[PDB]
Design a protein around this nucleic acid. Sequence first.
DNA 1: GACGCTATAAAAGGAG
DNA 2: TCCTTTTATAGCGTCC
Length: 89
Amino acid sequence: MERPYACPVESCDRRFSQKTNLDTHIRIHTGQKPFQCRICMRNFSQHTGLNQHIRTHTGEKPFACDICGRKFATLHTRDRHTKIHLRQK
DNA sequence: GACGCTATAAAAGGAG
DNA sequence: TCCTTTTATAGCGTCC
Ligand SMILES: [Zn+2]
Ligand SMILES: [Zn+2]
Ligand SMILES: [Zn+2]
């Protein structure tokens, strides 16, 4: 069994290797958000959801682009940006 | 075009 | 293992 943990929701039925990931996933169904932003008090489903958000307050931009050295708050925004240097408008 | 941001999935770290 | 963190992937929505 590579992914022994299955989602209880008949409709969804997503599979996971670690039980942690299954519990975290189930939260999207129940709508429970255990991670709270201490500035605006908003709630998030994940550790990363909260971390991505704290940066909107702090203005921290950890991710730099290799080509132009421009900074971004999140990983995806940075990765997606780099692709523009490989094409025209 | 570009990118700020939220969501969510996949994986890894660390301690008992 | 269980719990904490980290990395990856998808879109949305809006301004340019
Ligand atoms: Zn599910
Ligand atoms: Zn906040
Ligand atoms: Zn760049």
